[PDB]
Amino acid sequence: SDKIIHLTDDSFDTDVLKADGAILVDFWAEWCGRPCKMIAPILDEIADEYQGKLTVAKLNIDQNPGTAPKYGIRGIPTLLLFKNGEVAATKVGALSKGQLKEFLDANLA
Ligand SMILES: [Cu+2]
Fold first, then answer.
1. CA proximity to 67, closest of 4, 12, 15
2. Ligand 1 centroid vs 41 CA: distance in angstroms?
3. Which end of the chain is flanked by fewer CB atoms within 10 Å, N or C?
C-alpha cells in the first residue's frame, strides 16, 4: 500500500477533483469480504506499474459517507476512473489484473 492515496471526504475535492491527470478510486468498507480483498493486491501492482501515468487511491465508505452518494455508488468494490475532474468510466465488483489493465488501457488514450 505505499503508493495508494488514502482519501477522506475532506480531501477528495483536492486530491481527486483538482488533480492533474488520472486517478483510480477504490470505494470499499471492511464489511466487503472476499471481493475487496481480492482486488487490493492487484491495485498495489497497478499503482507501481502505472507510476506517472495514473494515481490509485482508496476511500472507505463507512468512515467517509458523503462521497459515494454524489457519484451514485450502489455496491463496493466500485472503481471509478477520474481524468482531470471528470468520471471517465466505472468498474463494479472484483476483477482480475488482466481485465483491470484492459479497463485502464482503453481509458487512458
Ligand atoms: Cu505499497
1. 12
2. 9
3. C
